[PDB]
């Protein structure tokens, strides 16, 4: 009878079977082990601030050849070194080194076929300033 | 099926089978309708008066329509000493 017990005094076997088989999910296992509270670089938050250590010319080769513009940051809350993408600025003229940056998440899945990376994070603010309004020229950036 | 006014609201009443009493649907082409001619005292067939039977595609396809039509005929007095109810 469908390989599972159907007796009317068998609720215990059913719920122990569910608690054993829910560890095969992905979100459950990340969620009840405290994965984000231990090893994820944001520590389970939606944003983070950090200090720019480097500007990086990452390369995406195949099948799209592009020069990815990234930034190696050291986060303030953790002491954690994270590279992150910065959009829409070909010059990175709003970014210098040793500036403070508000980062968010970024869902690009890079490919394995040509060693192209998808870094996990985008730049939202530099030096307190909205990077969008910089690139759309609605504010000016204080340069320290 | 009718409405609250008591008038019928269907497109058509389906023909039911006779061997298994199930519905002969609008596309059962393996089913069959049988006419058997009413005879005269001289043994002449009456032209426009038949006894009808309905033998559905499941019945006919399974390989049963002969025996079932024998049963229906002897129970309607068209055969005798053919279909035995005990086997």
């Amino acid at each position: 009878g469908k390989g599972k017990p159907r007796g009317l005094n068998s609720a215990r076997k059913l719920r122990v079977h569910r608690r054993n088989n829910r560890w095969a999910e992905n979100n459950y296992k990340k969620r009840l082990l405290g994965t984000a509270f231990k090893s994820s670089p944001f520590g389970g938050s939606s944003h983070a601030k950090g200090i720019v250590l480097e500007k990086l010319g990452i390369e995406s080769k195949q099948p799209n050849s592009a020069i990815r513009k990234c930034v190696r940051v050291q986060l303030i809350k953790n002491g954690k070194k994270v590279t992150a993408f910065v959009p829409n600025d070909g010059c990175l003229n709003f970014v210098d080194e040793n500036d403070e940056v508000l980062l968010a998440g970024f869902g690009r899945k890079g490919k394995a076929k040509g060693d192209i990376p998808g870094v996990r994070f985008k730049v939202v603010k530099v030096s307190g300033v909205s990077l969008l309004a910089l690139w759309k020229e609605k504010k000016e950036k204080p340069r320290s | 099926m009718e409405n609250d006014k008591g008038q019928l609201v269907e497109l058509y009443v389906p023909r039911k089978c006779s061997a298994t009493n199930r519905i002969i649907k609008a596309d059962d082409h393996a089913s069959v309708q049988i006419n058997v001619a009413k005879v005269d005292e001289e043994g002449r067939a009456i032209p426009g008066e038949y006894v009808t039977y309905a033998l559905s595609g499941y019945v006919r396809s399974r390989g049963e329509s002969d025996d079932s039509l024998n049963r229906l005929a002897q129970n309607d007095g068209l055969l005798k000493n053919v279909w035995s109810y005990s086997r």
Binding site: - | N3, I24, A26, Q33
Partner: protein
């Protein structure tokens, strides 16, 4: 002027059959779409899909077109037809024709009470094609059609006003889905209910009442 070739067709041309309910009543095989066109004058088609398919025919890479077409009355007479042809418009037209041939009726019924016209279906039904299973459940009045827009359009070409749907399987491949929904709406005249337990006498065909007419000379 259309000349028939079938004795059903020259019955239909003679004005000796009025509705398709005789043909639906007698389980007849139709082979002339002109019968359907003369008996459903308010039959309104709609294309569901036209798609170029690349053939490899005797060293020739060519482009044909698969046309999935649904015809359907605003009352309960539905038809499905799928046709591959060399041209777009020829595939359209012959898919219309194949949908004219495979017209089946539906039994749309009530949910709950008995007022006015039947709006929903009469029971639950289920169709399957490929791995696509489509389950139809009756719905209260004015609840619309809870269905994906292909299936929803095939149901709007039936005069089905209210139905809940659930599917299962890979419903990406839309021709399996339309075939499964078409089987589900064909099986509604296939489930025996207690209000049709009443024994009915078997009526005669038009083939024998009108046997002296409509014979090949």
């Amino acid at each position: 002027g259309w000349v028939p070739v079938t004795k059903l067709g020259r019955l239909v041309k003679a004005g000796k059959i009025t509705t398709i309910e005789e043909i639906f009543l007698h389980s007849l095989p139709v082979k002339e779409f002109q019968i359907i066109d003369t008996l459903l004058p308010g039959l309104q088609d709609e294309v569901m899909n036209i798609k170029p398919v690349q053939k490899q025919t005797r060293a020739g890479q060519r482009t044909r077109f698969k046309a999935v077409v649904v015809v359907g009355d605003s009352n309960g007479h539905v038809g499905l037809g799928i046709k591959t042809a060399k041209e777009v418009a020829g595939a359209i037209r012959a898919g219309i024709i194949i949908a004219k041939l495979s017209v089946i009726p539906i039994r749309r019924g009530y949910w709950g009470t008995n007022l006015g016209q039947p709006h929903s279906l009469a029971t639950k039904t289920t169709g399957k094609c490929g791995s696509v299973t489509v389950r139809l459940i009756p719905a209260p009045r004015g609840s619309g059609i809870v269905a994906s827009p292909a299936v929803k359009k095939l149901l709007q070409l039936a005069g089905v006003e209210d139905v809940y749907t659930q599917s299962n399987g890979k419903t990406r491949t839309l021709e399996n889905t339309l075939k499964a929904a078409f089987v589900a709406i064909g099986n509604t005249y296939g489930f025996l209910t207690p209000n049709l337990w009443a024994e009915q006498p078997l009526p005669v065909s038009p083939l024998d009442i009108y046997s002296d007419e409509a014979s090949a000379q």
